[PDB]
Amino acid sequence: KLDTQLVNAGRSKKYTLGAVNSVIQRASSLVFDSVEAKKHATRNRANGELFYGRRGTLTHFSLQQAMCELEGGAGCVLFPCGAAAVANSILAFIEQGDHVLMTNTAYEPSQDFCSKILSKLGVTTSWFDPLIGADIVKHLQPNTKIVFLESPGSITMEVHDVPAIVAAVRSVVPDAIIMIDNTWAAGVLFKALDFGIDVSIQAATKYLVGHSDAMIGTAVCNARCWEQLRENAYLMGQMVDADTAYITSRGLRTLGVRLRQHHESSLKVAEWLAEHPQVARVNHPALPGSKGHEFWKRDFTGSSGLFSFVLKKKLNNEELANYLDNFSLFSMAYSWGGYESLILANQPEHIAAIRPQGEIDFSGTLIRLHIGLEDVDDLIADLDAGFARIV
Amino acid sequence: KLDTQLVNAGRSKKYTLGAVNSVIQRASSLVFDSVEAKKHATRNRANGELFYGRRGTLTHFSLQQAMCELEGGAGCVLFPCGAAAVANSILAFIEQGDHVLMTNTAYEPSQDFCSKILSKLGVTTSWFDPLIGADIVKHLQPNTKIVFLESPGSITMEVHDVPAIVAAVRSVVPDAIIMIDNTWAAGVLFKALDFGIDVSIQAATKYLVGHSDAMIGTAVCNARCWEQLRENAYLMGQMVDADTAYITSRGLRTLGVRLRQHHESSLKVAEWLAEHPQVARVNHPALPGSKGHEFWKRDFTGSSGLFSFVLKKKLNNEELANYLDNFSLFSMAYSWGGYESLILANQPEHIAAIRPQGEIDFSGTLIRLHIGLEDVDDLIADLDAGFARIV
Amino acid sequence: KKLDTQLVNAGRSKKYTLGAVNSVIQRASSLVFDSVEAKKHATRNRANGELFYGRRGTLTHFSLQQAMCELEGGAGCVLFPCGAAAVANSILAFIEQGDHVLMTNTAYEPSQDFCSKILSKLGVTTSWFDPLIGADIVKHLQPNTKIVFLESPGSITMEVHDVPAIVAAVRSVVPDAIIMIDNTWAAGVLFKALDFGIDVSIQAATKYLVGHSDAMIGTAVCNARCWEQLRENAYLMGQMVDADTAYITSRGLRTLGVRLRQHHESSLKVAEWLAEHPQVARVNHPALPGSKGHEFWKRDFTGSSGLFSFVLKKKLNNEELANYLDNFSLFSMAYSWGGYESLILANQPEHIAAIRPQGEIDFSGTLIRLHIGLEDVDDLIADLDAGFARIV
Amino acid sequence: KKLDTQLVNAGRSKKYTLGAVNSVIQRASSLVFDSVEAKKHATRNRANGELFYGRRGTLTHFSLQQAMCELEGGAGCVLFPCGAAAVANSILAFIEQGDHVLMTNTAYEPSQDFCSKILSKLGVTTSWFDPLIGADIVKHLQPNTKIVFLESPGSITMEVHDVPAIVAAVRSVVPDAIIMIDNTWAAGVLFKALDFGIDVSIQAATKYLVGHSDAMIGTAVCNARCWEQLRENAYLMGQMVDADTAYITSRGLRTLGVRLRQHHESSLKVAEWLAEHPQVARVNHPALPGSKGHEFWKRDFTGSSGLFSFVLKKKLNNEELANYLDNFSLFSMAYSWGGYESLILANQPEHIAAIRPQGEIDFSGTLIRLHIGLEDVDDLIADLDAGFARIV
Ligand SMILES: Cc1ncc(COP(=O)(O)O)c(C/N=C(\C=C\OCCN)C(=O)O)c1O
Ligand SMILES: Cc1ncc(COP(=O)(O)O)c(C/N=C(\C=C\OCCN)C(=O)O)c1O
Ligand SMILES: Cc1ncc(COP(=O)(O)O)c(C/N=C(\C=C\OCCN)C(=O)O)c1O
Ligand SMILES: Cc1ncc(COP(=O)(O)O)c(C/N=C(\C=C\OCCN)C(=O)O)c1O
């Protein structure tokens, strides 16, 4: 029934007014017919009553309802981008003197936010290995306020054993807020809230939008954390425009057919690379032997299309240009989650720098690939040609 | 030449590609043709080179260029709304142990951000009277990092003597960052940066958009503050969508003809209210006898259309409903800066609560009015009718 | 009550805005019926503002249609993809093989080409008349004349018709003629066509209603007599406009008053300056005395917009034209007009003569058409004066 | 190389994307010329992808036009406000008074009404033929037959033409006929019309190309022989589509492959289930054996989409129809199709008979048309089965 949910989520007549998709209500000012109406809206300003554009319009409410039913939360808070969803969700719960424990495989800017902004506000951050499991208790402090997860991890793709981590945390620091950047799973391939996680964050910019042309972040919360996240994110003036909200609800409609193709093509490319002579290791959660694959297998209901692989050799500057500059179907660009395939290289030194209190375990150039909706065989032929270029 | 600037700002062929308005480039992913191109874009990622959607696309660059030339700054940082521009601009400069001095007439949520978020991060905030002038030195502390101005003040409209305030601050705490919420003047009727102010903030949501259908915030900085504001706002993931940026550059084009009408009609309504039997006081910066009118006269080059007036009596709940519920041309709604006229009432107790370390000086109901583009005589006839309703 | 108040509030009922200041944007092809009963009711009112199918429109289109009817005082408003679509389909909606179309020879060129390239192969004939024919237009009326097409001011050359004379003359001979007017220059509000007995007022809303040079749309406001036929035949041709453009046009209306007063005030000052200039042979501005039809404009209109033209005393050659046109800094070379930026276009006498059917032009120097935008007028005057110096 | 790879990359050259993945949205009426030289060059190439005027298009339109030509293999692609506009204006572009139009009697109804209500008053006659006439279509050809209009599968009833037979038959008699086809059901990619000798392939891109029920647009991809005439005459009628809809359609193309495979796989499973159902008289699905034209579909197409219909053994009365239609939870009642949600519409035999010119229908029970969306097929089957139970 996921396909049915995706098609129907947030589509109440209150929001569609007869149309299939919700109406786009662009507004800052929202008019009150009377003093009584104004009083009523004021009281319900955070409960879906039209009050002021910063809180949202019908278009925002439709998307919020959809996100809550898809991820099973008590409320959904919207942001300009995923990076804003991360930074502000963390900021809504911290106070001078708190400690933030974050996986060392977190998206780089999430780490930078902690070490550059939080540090100057009297908050300390320490990092942990993705595969630590129940031993995470060795990193918990009495002042640990937030435990920040990201599975699969950025770039290297390690999958956490979320259940073990959550049990260990609840037993030591029950009051901690456990957050996860659940972007890779698009919030549906891994039901974060069902595993005891308080807040599931997404750079909806990726698979929810699915077309590389809108930026937005979401934070679906459980009943325990919603109000504080909502109200504090609001004091920071966080919101997203009505059109992007519309485009995001629109992306959900094809989320199922897209993810199935991404899963199928990326897995096929992964198995092919795994058997290739110039490839040292393939980091794809659905692929056996990949770090945490066992947890992906037990906890997830699917795969999306982003993964990486490590070459047997470290390419020099000329080899790198020769390799990357001549692809036909893969484009060099940041982000992912769209219909077109993307490729980016990372040297071992680059990764070593973004793995705090951790150690890198490969020596060849790492290539991150996003497998789009093109024909898988055409993509493979393009990769094979690339290999021949650095042979 | 303001009219000519407004029509031409940010309209380089690089952004228009032959069109009159800039193209709308929606994107998260931005493609690099080669490794060399990628390296070049990386190095210039903050200098207008296409790099990644979070930094912006051609559409954002066009708006940034326009804002910088109109306000005379070194750079312009964009936000989801004015409230985000305020909260994040302040956050980019503070550190645990700092002190924030803010005018007590600041927009309420700007105050709440300070007392609710900043307080828990080891930052203290104290407030000051709008008309304090050079005596502001009595509130400066050695750890005063930010001095936050707002002229005219929200709701009550007091105008600061910015030059006196800036001189006093520079003489005691040279390193302080002086910020101003320059929304009422739409950044053009008061050139904040020419008075020694470091950052001019705007809820572009108001007069720049001018149609009540988009939310955005801008922060134009001097060369001294730009980089830190830019980079820190970026770690918080602050940005605005490409379409809203487009709509904002589009609003600038008619900014001049709109402001002249707003100025002319609001001044006419102000002079009429000032002579009305049921009105105790009219708070309009352009109107003689208004708090700080002398500074508005010396420092500003015009007026916009927002102002307030105080009735001779405090309306009871029935009188209030009877008065507000039966207007024909004024709508009850938040925000302002659009083409339609708006009205909102505030009891003296409500204001007293949002004037920290200050005292309220009126006892009658305060009515805030935004004078739109309707026929001024029709608006006056509607107000007169309202008076007759509470006579 | 007054125009400005009407412009601000037209079409903005709660039914379309739902609490917001502007109407909602309802993008749709499919519109859902809750029941067989609801479907029946919508079908029966599919042309009277009940949601039925996107080709007929959504809430957003109805808001604009209502604003247009209110402003121009019509019984219905039909929407098209652009102004040329409005002209071509409005004419097509009323003709049959064997009908005759009488059109002003100052009609916008594509309007002429439609008649002589499309209409002709369908057995419809077209003849033209001088804008200033007035009551003498009876000499061109035929028994099979179905449509009389006016355009005041005329395109490029700006002649104003003595509409009251033309209408009375035509109604005395062919009472049942369908009189139409391309009322783009006046933006439908500076000249109330339907009050003068005209049947359909057409506008390339692309110009002043949108006001920013970034959207295209055509409108046709009709009296009660002509509404159903224009509506249904334009519908059979699949004519419509997207919801977003409808929103932007409704949005353009809100500042139409303040913008028009600025275009009027500014173009007039430029016209007066040009009039007294040594290198200008004549200025064709409806608001300037001695201009063709000035007294009719003065009598029938309630304002002016910013487009007009003037004639140089000299007919520029190729090098002089490039040196003149290529070096402007405030006037851009581009088609269309009605926006916030100032535009300039040049026409040689032979180009205009080529598009003045059954008529003779009255000038021999290069004609310059100017659209006066919202820039500072003294800056605009300075830019032109530099242009004059490149010609000497 | 393969379809999916083509769908992802079609029309996306750097010239239109400027570094982004999708083409830029260039909203414009006015397009500025830097010099007289640049204006001359743009004028001369105004119809060959050089920025000239918004009515001709901007970068955004050119990106889509290029994608469409590539996908359907045409020489040019013309854009319209909607599918009905594409059909009506494509026909109008080629006829003259005295011409004859031969159209399938299973053509979408408004396509028929255009011919019999508009074309007729311009001296053009129209006759119809059975979808399955094949090579016997020669019996309806006249010396003045200018256009042969096909629509396979036919609207509502889904008959598939034996196009290769029809084309050869027509070319043997009237070589210079302009053969046109409404290729909406196949989304222009499941049946390559231009490869079968058809001149113009028309689509209501509103359906599958947009794929989300929120935008309207019509396309006409032409061979080299018919491009200029369709283009220029559609232009004289002011036909165009807004830049934003062009962007959304280009965007719809990218997921067209994955969506179509799901519509095919799902509708087929529903068709097979319905076929074996006690209350179903017949199932009209081109991919289902025993369906009209199945072997032609099997032979000429490369897939199926999600729209089809079936006939109940009973002809429902008013109460039964409401009880049936009003209680569905997954199928919405609405016009159009081609999106992500499942839709249902009912037709009585007399309604269809009323729109089957010079033909006889072959059923007597209530006909139900279904659009199978992207929902879970077992959920869809369950909803229908509950409907069947309300009828018993
Ligand atoms: C897991 C994950 N979370 C959060 C974010 C931030 O979302 P945004 O703010 O962009 O909507 C990203 C974006 N990740 C990429 C974007 C990088 O852009 C380059 C500059 N940092 C990427 O290439 O992996 C991400 O990969
Ligand atoms: C001077 C000033 N600065 C900043 C802001 C915040 O901008 P925003 O985030 O909305 O784009 C406002 C909005 N002020 C109003 C908005 C209020 O909404 C009601 C809820 N606070 C108002 O009615 O004065 C303002 O008046
Ligand atoms: C009086 C008038 N009516 C109708 C139209 C057509 O409206 P549209 O289809 O463009 O929405 C125009 C456009 N006029 C110009 C634009 C045309 O440029 C293309 C070549 N004709 C012009 O330069 O005056 C016009 O000036
Ligand atoms: C095969 C076919 N061609 C052309 C069109 C017209 O495309 P449009 O103008 O709508 O973009 C339709 C629309 N068909 C339907 C929609 C019509 O509803 C309105 C009444 N006809 C339908 O229910 O099948 C169609 O089904």
Side-chain angles (χ1 to χ4, degrees), chain D residues 109-227 229-268 270-275 277-313 315-318 320-326:
Chain D
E109 191 187 2
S111 296
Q112 296 186 21
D113 293 8
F114 160 69
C115 290
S116 80
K117 292 186 174 67
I118 305 294
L119 284 198
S120 51
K121 77 184 187 163
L122 303 170
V124 171
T125 59
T126 304
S127 61
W128 329 83
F129 66 91
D130 191 85
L132 298 170
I133 198 66
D136 278 359
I137 197 169
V138 290
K139 304 189 309 189
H140 302 87
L141 291 174
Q142 295 182 193
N144 64 332
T145 299
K146 172 61 83 59
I147 287 163
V148 181
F149 193 97
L150 316 179
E151 182 171 334
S152 193
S155 291
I156 305 178
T157 53
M158 324 301 307
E159 298 87 343
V160 184
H161 289 330
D162 180 353
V163 168
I166 293 183
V167 168
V170 171
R171 295 301 189 204
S172 73
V173 175
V174 205
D176 63 327
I178 294 140
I179 302 173
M180 295 189 188
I181 187 173
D182 184 325
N183 207 191
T184 301
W185 187 95
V189 292
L190 301 184
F191 173 71
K192 302 291 250 58
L194 275 52
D195 278 358
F196 285 79
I198 291 167
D199 296 291
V200 185
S201 175
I202 303 167
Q203 280 197 64
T206 300
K207 319 304 178 196
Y208 290 111
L209 299 202
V210 167
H212 302 74
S213 324
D214 67 345
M216 299 189 75
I217 169 181
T219 56
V221 178
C222 310
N223 56 14
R225 170 190 172 222
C226 296
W227 191 36
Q229 174 165 352
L230 189 55
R231 187 184 72 223
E232 293 305 317
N233 293 345
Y235 188 70
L236 248 11
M237 294 301 289
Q239 296 312 98
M240 65 169 281
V241 75
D242 68 283
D244 281 85
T245 299
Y247 177 90
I248 277 301
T249 305
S250 282
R251 203 183 182 265
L253 301 184
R254 317 300 172 205
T255 58
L256 186 65
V258 304
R259 287 187 285 106
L260 283 182
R261 288 191 284 285
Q262 187 63 52
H263 292 296
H264 183 343
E265 202 187 299
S266 300
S267 62
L268 189 59
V270 181
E272 290 170 324
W273 176 77
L274 284 170
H277 194 100
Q279 295 160 258
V280 170
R282 186 221 297 168
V283 178
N284 308 307
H285 191 127
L288 202 50
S291 204
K292 269 173 275 303
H294 181 261
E295 299 282 341
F296 305 141
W297 168 81
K298 187 176 159 188
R299 183 192 66 210
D300 306 320
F301 288 64
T302 61
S304 171
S305 72
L307 183 80
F308 72 103
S309 60
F310 69 96
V311 187
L312 290 168
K313 289 187 176 179
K315 187 209 171 177
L316 323 183
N317 58 56
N318 283 355
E320 297 178 316
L321 202 58
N323 184 240
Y324 178 63
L325 294 175
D326 297 354

Side-chain angles (χ1 to χ4, degrees), chain C residues 82-84 108 110 151 155 182 184 204 206-207 216-217 335-337 369, chain D residues 53 55:
Chain C
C82 63
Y108 172 56
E151 182 171 334
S155 291
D182 184 325
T184 301
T206 300
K207 319 304 178 196
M216 299 189 75
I217 169 181
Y335 282 103
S336 200
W337 38 277
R369 191 183 64 168
Chain D
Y53 185 57
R55 204 190 301 132

